[PDB]
A paper describes a structure:
Cocrystallization of SilF38-120 with either Ag(I) or Cu(I) under anaerobic conditions yields an orthorhombic unit cell with three protein chains per asymmetric unit and each chain with one metal ion bound close to one end of the β-barrel. In both the Ag(I)- and Cu(I)-bound structures, the metal ion is coordinated with distorted tetrahedral geometry through the donor groups NE2 of His63 and the two thiol groups of Met74 and Met76. The Cu(I) coordination geometry within the binding site is noticeably different than that of Ag(I) where the fourth coordination position of the Cu(I) ion is occupied by a water molecule. The Trp71 is now blocked from directly interacting with the metal. Such flexibility allows the protein to provide ligands at shorter coordination distances so as to accommodate the smaller ion. By contrast, the conformations of Met76 and His63 remain unchanged between structures. The differing role of water in the two binding mechanisms allows an adaptability of the binding site to accommodate the two different cations with similar affinity.
Biophysical and biochemical analysis of proteins comprising the sil gene cluster has been limited to date, with sequence homology used to infer function and the proposed resistance mechanism, after comparison with the more extensively studied cus and cue systems. The protein has a β-barrel topology composed of five β-stands arranged in the β1-β2-β3-β5-β4-β1, similar to that observed for Cu(I) chaperone CusF. The X-ray crystal structures show that the metal ion–binding site is formed from strictly conserved residues His63, Trp71, Met74, and Met76 located at one end of the β-barrel.
Numbering used by the authors:
A (entry chain A): 11 to 89
B (entry chain D): 11 to 90
The structure:
C-alpha cells in the first residue's frame, strides 16, 4: 500500500538541465510485468543531475530507484 | 508505461464471497520497495475464489498476480 519505490538499472541516454529530466534505457522489471525500454524521468531532487552526467559520459549501466505516478516517472536515486 | 502486473506469493488468510475479496499474507516484493504484509485483493472469477478457498484450507503458499488501482488490488491470476 505504501508508495512503490522501483529499483531499476539502465544506461543514461539524455539529460536536460532546464526541464530537470533524464532519459534512461532501462532493463526489464519482470516483477511488475514491465519490459526493457527507454523513457524520461523528472528528478525529484534537482541536485541528482550531477552523478547522472557522469553516467551519461561513461555510458555505464547504473542502478536507480524511481516512482511511477500514472504516466509521470520521478527519479529518486541513482549511482 | 504498460500497466504493472505484480507477481507475489503468500498464504490466503480470509475470503469474503459477498464483498468478493481475498486476504493474503504476501511476501516482500523488494523490486518495488514493498514489505511482507497482509492486505485484501478484489477477485472477479469464481475459479479464483475456489482455488483461494482450497489454499485457505491447506494454508499453502500460492503464487498470484495483481493490478494496483489506487486503493484497490485486483487479482489477475492465482495458482496452487
Ligand atoms: Cu543494458
Ligand atoms: Cu519504462
Ligand atoms: Cu510465507
Ligand atoms: Cu500488501
Amino acid at each position: 500500500m505504501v508508495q512503490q519505490v522501483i529499483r531499476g538499472s539502465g544506461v543514461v541516454k539524455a539529460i536536460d538541465m532546464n526541464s530537470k529530466k533524464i532519459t534512461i534505457s532501462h532493463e526489464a522489471i519482470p516483477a511488475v510485468g514491465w519490459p526493457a525500454m527507454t523513457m524520461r524521468f523528472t528528478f525529484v531532487n534537482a541536485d541528482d543531475a550531477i552523478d547522472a552526467i557522469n553516467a551519461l559520459k561513461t555510458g555505464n549501466h547504473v542502478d536507480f530507484s524511481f516512482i511511477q505516478q500514472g504516466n509521470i516517472s520521478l527519479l529518486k536515486s541513482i549511482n
